Design a binder for this molecule. Structure first.
Ligand code: ZFJ
Length: 133
């Protein structure tokens, strides 16, 4: 269950607005984001990942190597500098983003053709589920 390769289509998205509000994204743009169809495209080779989230108005890409800290500028989101680090905790892929916000990061659970994603910031957790296309 350590294979996240694929195109992933959203099945559920809970507390999306609370998570976006914790990150301080504009109320008006949060309203638009909650209606957009989001597609997750992941390419994974060894320790190297390319992750792409696509919608009609907002796009987000990140590339990283498991175990190698990297500087991340969330130019597409809340426009903050964080020190990001992605690791394996068993079969869970864990990202911690050190910076202004506490408890910032995300976890992914690849159970066959289903991907569970939890985005955290502060006291907010957004839970998403995707199915491999
Ligand atoms: C490993 C998965 C990480 C991941 C999955 C889905 C999204 C993100 C990161 C964000 C934080 C980049 C993000 C932002 C949005 N917005 C509304 C469209 C604001 C740009 C949606 C989905 C994801």
């Amino acid at each position: 269950t350590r294979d996240a390769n694929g195109t992933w289509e959203m099945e559920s998205n809970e507390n999306f607005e609370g998570w976006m509000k914790a990150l301080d994204i504009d109320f008006a743009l949060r309203k638009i984001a909650v209606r957009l169809t989001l597609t997750l495209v992941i390419d994974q080779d060894g320790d190297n990942f390319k992750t792409k989230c696509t919608s009609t108005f907002y796009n987000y890409d990140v590339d990283f190597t498991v175990g190698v800290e990297f500087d991340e500028y969330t130019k597409s989101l809340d426009n903050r500098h964080v020190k990001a680090l992605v690791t394996w905790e068993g079969d869970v892929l864990v990202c911690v983003q050190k910076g202004e916000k506490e408890n910032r990061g995300w976890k992914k659970w690849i159970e066959g053709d289903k991907l569970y994603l939890e985005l955290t910031c502060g006291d907010q957790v957004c839970r998403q589920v995707f199915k491999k296309k």
